[PDB]
């Protein structure tokens, strides 16, 4: 039979059968209970709208993501999300399909063990396998080397790989991602008068960020230009009218990636953690990693980031090496495409964690040889 390539993610759940080009169903991972009282009788009001249904009734819900930073903080809601994904968005019972979840690097063990225990006890799948979210993004590019920066919505991690041999001592995981950029944008919009507070209006700020923000090639020059002319002010129409005008908030929101001091984080930007991740590698594979830097994940879709990052790394790196940044147009679904490719391989067909194996060793089987 065919395998189910699910990809929990944090912000958008992407799923679909193995062997295709794009995920079949992509929908936000939010579960929102209603918060008001409700007076109409017999309206058929449910107790929790999940997935894309709660992005249409969000006016009277309190949306809450079940995955904070890679890790899962609310297991009941995550179980509800998985149940919805299997039964309503794909309509395939899990009793007859292997599953291939994905997990960020350096995550707590208990999260992974609970994930496999749920998949084997509640949904009762035949066999499931958990894979690191960066190796798949490297599969999708058709490479076999390279250092991949997978800046998702929950957590940004940077896994270097050479000739198929991952370097476990050079993984640099940073917890700045799309959600923190949404919060920072929502916080700097208040400088013009627009106040978004409700958890429903966070979605509106996210839409503003997606449609308007861009990464500046040079930050100081843009700050000077936006403060003199008015060629940058782009307007946007809220879900009820009252258009708003975003000035130099456009390139200040995604600039947080390269200067995490804006949101008070100490660490260095995504332009310098990649160079540090490279320098921890051996001295003989640094040229190949320099030449095959891969971008993935949703947050790396800002217009103009593949040039800013290249300029920064070229500034840091030695002058002789060639710096090349692979930015495929299908960046958002790169991890899932790689997952489909991996699940479609014949050599991989014996790596699944078969159910009888789980019955013999318990949920701690995932840390064992079947990784």
């Amino acid at each position: 039979t065919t395998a189910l390539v699910c990809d929990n993610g944090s912000g958008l759940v992407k799923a679909g059968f193995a062997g295709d080009d794009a995920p079949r169903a992509v929908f936000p991972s939010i579960v929102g209970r209603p918060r008001h009282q409700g007076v109409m009788v017999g309206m058929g009001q449910k107790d929790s709208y999940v997935g894309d249904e709660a992005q249409s009734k969000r006016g009277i819900l309190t949306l809450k993501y079940p995955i904070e930073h890679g890790i899962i903080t609310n297991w009941d809601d995550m179980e509800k999300i998985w149940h919805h994904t299997f039964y309503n968005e794909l309509r395939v019972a899990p009793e007859e399909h292997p599953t291939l979840l994905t997990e960020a690097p350096l995550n707590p063990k208990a999260n992974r063990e609970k994930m496999t225990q749920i998949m084997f006890e509640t949904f009762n799948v035949p066999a499931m396998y958990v894979a690191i979210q960066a190796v798949l993004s490297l599969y999708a590019s058709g490479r076999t080397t390279g250092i991949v920066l997978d800046s998702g919505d929950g957590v940004t991690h940077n896994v270097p790989i050479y000739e198929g041999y991952a370097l476990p001592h050079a993984i640099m995981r940073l917890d700045l991602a799309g959600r923190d950029l949404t919060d920072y944008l929502m916080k700097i919009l208040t400088e013009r008068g627009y106040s978004f507070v409700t958890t429903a209006e966070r979605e509106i700020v996210r839409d503003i960020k997606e449609k308007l923000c861009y990464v500046a090639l040079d930050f100081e020059n843009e700050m000077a230009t936006a403060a003199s002319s008015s060629s940058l002010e782009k307007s946007y129409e809220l879900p009820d009218g009252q258009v708003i005008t975003i000035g130099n908030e456009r390139f200040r929101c995604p600039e947080t990636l390269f200067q995490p001091s804006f949101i008070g984080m100490e660490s260095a930007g995504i332009h310098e953690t990649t160079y540090n991740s490279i320098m921890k590698c051996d001295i003989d594979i640094r040229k190949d990693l320099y030449a095959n830097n891969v971008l993935s994940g949703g947050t790396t879709m800002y217009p103009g980031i593949a040039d800013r990052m290249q300029k920064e790394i070229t500034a840091l790196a030695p002058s002789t090496m060639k710096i090349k940044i692979i930015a495929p147009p299908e960046r958002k679904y790169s991890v899932w495409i790689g997952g489909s490719i991996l699940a479609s391989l014949s050599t991989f067909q014996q790596m699944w964690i078969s159910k009888q194996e789980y019955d013999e060793a318990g949920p701690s089987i995932v840390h064992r040889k079947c990784f």
């Binding site: 861009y214 217009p303 103009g304 593949a306």
Partner: protein
């Protein structure tokens, strides 16, 4: 009685006419909605081309 019949006839015609006008304005509002969708789509496509070209 004759005057009542005349007034009732004219009022019924007026009701029919306002129904026709409301249907016509519904049709033209729908057409304007379609053209607004057209402009939204064309502006979105132009922005997509702009971001693709600026981002290679």
């Amino acid at each position: 009685s004759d005057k009542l019949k005349e007034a009732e006839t004219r009022a019924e015609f007026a009701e029919r006419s306002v129904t026709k006008l409301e249907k016509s304005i519904d049709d033209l509002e729908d057409e304007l909605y379609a053209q607004k969708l057209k402009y939204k789509a064309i502006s979105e496509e132009l922005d997509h081309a702009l971001n693709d070209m600026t981002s290679i």
